[PDB]
Amino acid sequence: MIYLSRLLIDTGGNPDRPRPGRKWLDNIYNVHRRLSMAFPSGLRREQDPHFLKPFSPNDFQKTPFLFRVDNNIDGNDKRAIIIVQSVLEPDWDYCFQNALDFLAAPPETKEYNPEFKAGQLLRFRLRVNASVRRHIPEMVQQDGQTIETGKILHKRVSLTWDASSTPDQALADWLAAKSPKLGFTLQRCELLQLGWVYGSKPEPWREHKYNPLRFRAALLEGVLEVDDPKLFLKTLSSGIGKAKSFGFGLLSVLPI
């Protein structure tokens, strides 16, 4: 009995009109915060039922929520799509009661229920950031000449491939390697979005700071096969990759 709905964003029309939704999607933390507030704590509704106070996340409750940023249902209208799921009841009249300019159509929600079998075909779209934890030589200053010390910095490098390998079967081999651990097996998958995803974060007289959030996103699509139905119920609403809370874990439950 999972909670699947649709938020609908314009991303089009007259360029002269300032569209706050367009800058709302052009950052991770904005959509993250707005969908995180979309499950408010119950005592706030009893206290302020009108969404008319300076909020605080300590008053809010915390759940491993997750979304999906897509676009382009055609038919002579370019439009952008937000697909959200989590485990608690969301509210959309509470969330966007002052943000009617954010959307291009009123949101809609129905009841959806997923079922899985053994050795059954599926169709899926996932998004996982290309993340490989590596020891790197540090490279700072860069004032005319390179300067390094013996310290090896620890971070997650974006995925790279050898010069005799195209990106396509490299990410196919990544998905093939990650399949038997998570609980499925595929025969082929198609790469259709490899790119860079940028964002920024504020944090606590104090100031505010801007740092470029960095994620090597990978959105794929097409034809899934399963090995056991019991290895998929714990995958939905939790995520399979990294940047889990940032909207990188929705299992597209479309059996066809």
Instruction: Return residues touching another protein (CB under 8 A).
Output: 205-208
Q: How much of the chain is in helix, strand and coil states, percent to nearest 5?
A: 15, 25, 60
Length of the chain: 256
- Give me the least distance between CB of 58 and another protein, in Å please: 18
If the CB atoms of residues 154 and 206 are measured against another protein, the closer one turns out to be 206
Q: Which amino acid is at 16?
A: D
- Give me the least distance between CB of 102 and another protein, in Å please: 21
Beta-bridge partner residues of 153: 136
- Give me the least distance between CB of 202 and another protein, in Å please: 8
The CA distance from 85 to 67, in Å, is 6
Tell me how many degrees the CA angle 159-66-243 measures, rounded to the nearest 5.
25
- Give me the least distance between CB of 34 and another protein, in Å please: 18
* Residue whose structure tokens are 């009995």: 1
If the CB atoms of residues 50 and 206 are measured against another protein, the closer one turns out to be 206
- List the one residue out of 19, 37, 35, 13 whose CA is nearest residue 101: 19
15 three-state secondary structure:
coil
If the CB atoms of residues 162 and 207 are measured against another protein, the closer one turns out to be 207
If the CB atoms of residues 143 and 207 are measured against another protein, the closer one turns out to be 207
The CA distance from 27 to 24, in Å, is 7
If the CB atoms of residues 17 and 208 are measured against another protein, the closer one turns out to be 208
- Give me the least distance between CB of 204 and another protein, in Å please: 10
